[PDB]
Amino acid sequence: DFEEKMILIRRTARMQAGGRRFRFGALVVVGDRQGRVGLGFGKAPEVPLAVQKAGYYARRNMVEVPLQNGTIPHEIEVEFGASKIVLKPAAPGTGVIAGAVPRAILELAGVTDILTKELGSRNPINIAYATMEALRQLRTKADVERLRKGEAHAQAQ
RNA sequence: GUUGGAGAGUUUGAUCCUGGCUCAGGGUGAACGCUGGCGGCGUGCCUAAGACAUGCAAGUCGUGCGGGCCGCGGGGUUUUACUC
Ligand SMILES: [Mg+2]
Ligand SMILES: [Mg+2]
Ligand SMILES: [Mg+2]
Ligand SMILES: [Mg+2]
Ligand SMILES: [Mg+2]
Ligand SMILES: [Mg+2]
Ligand SMILES: [Mg+2]
């Protein structure tokens, strides 16, 4: 039981003696809009055999999300490849402003409001796990003063 | 109320990066085409600081002052001219 959007598909080429041969690849999201969200990337001989497979990888590739009033806890930036991904919390009423692919992934993960830009290289797939990582790395006003300080926690609080 | 930030297309049998050209967004003192019922409020030589006919666009005070003129009313003479 997981709602699951789909990001992008492509046909890629191998080669051989006498004509080409192929394979297709399917970028897939997942996510209970309250918290969680996965991604997959699936290759297979005939198309929706892949689109189906890509759904698989996403179930294991899950990322719980710190979510806070439908928005992002602090600001944030991450590189991965030469594709540079930006997030930043928006207020109630500003909502999934983000190009093509963060929208797909942020929405389904459950964001109401957010701000966003994409950078340099724009290839989907990088900006895909650009942001899978951007989100693996969100940190919370409590996860946090119990990363630091928490040396001696429960004397503080 | 940190009030605020969407990208894609295209080099290759295909893939990753660089990189240019390109399109989507809003903007006008606008013009051009097909079309054109109205009203309010704006607004209208961006080009030749090229050349301009005709009319108007800076005058007002008779309580600063002396007369022209064209009359009008009243006076010195019995009537004229002329004069106040
Ligand atoms: Mg780099
Ligand atoms: Mg680039
Ligand atoms: Mg080609
Ligand atoms: Mg804009
Ligand atoms: Mg226009
Ligand atoms: Mg006409
Ligand atoms: Mg002029």
According to DSSP H, which parts of chain A are helical?
Answer: 47-60, 100-110, 124-136
Nearest nucleotide to A14, CA against C1' atoms = B14
Count of structural domains within chain A: 2
- The contacts of residue A126 (CB under 8 Å, 6+ apart) are A80, A81, A82, A83
Owning domain of residue A1: 1-64
Distance A119 CA to B30 C1' (A): 37
Q: Tokens in use for A17?
A: 């003696």
Q: Assess whether A13 (CB) lies less than 7 A from strand B.
A: yes
A131 touches strand B (CB under 7 A): no
* A144 located within any domain: no
- Resolution to one decimal, Å: 3.4
Asked whether A51 and A4 are in contact (CB, 8 A), the reply is: no
Experimental method: X-ray
CATH number for the domain spanning A89: value is 3.30.230.10
In this structure, is residue A150 part of a structural domain? no
CA angle A29, A126, A105 (to 5 degrees): 25
Q: Are residues A46 and A93 in the same domain?
A: no
Residue A153 within a domain: no
A121 beta carbon < 7 A from strand B?
Answer: yes
Q: What gap in Å lies between CA A90 and CA A95, rounded to an integer?
A: 7
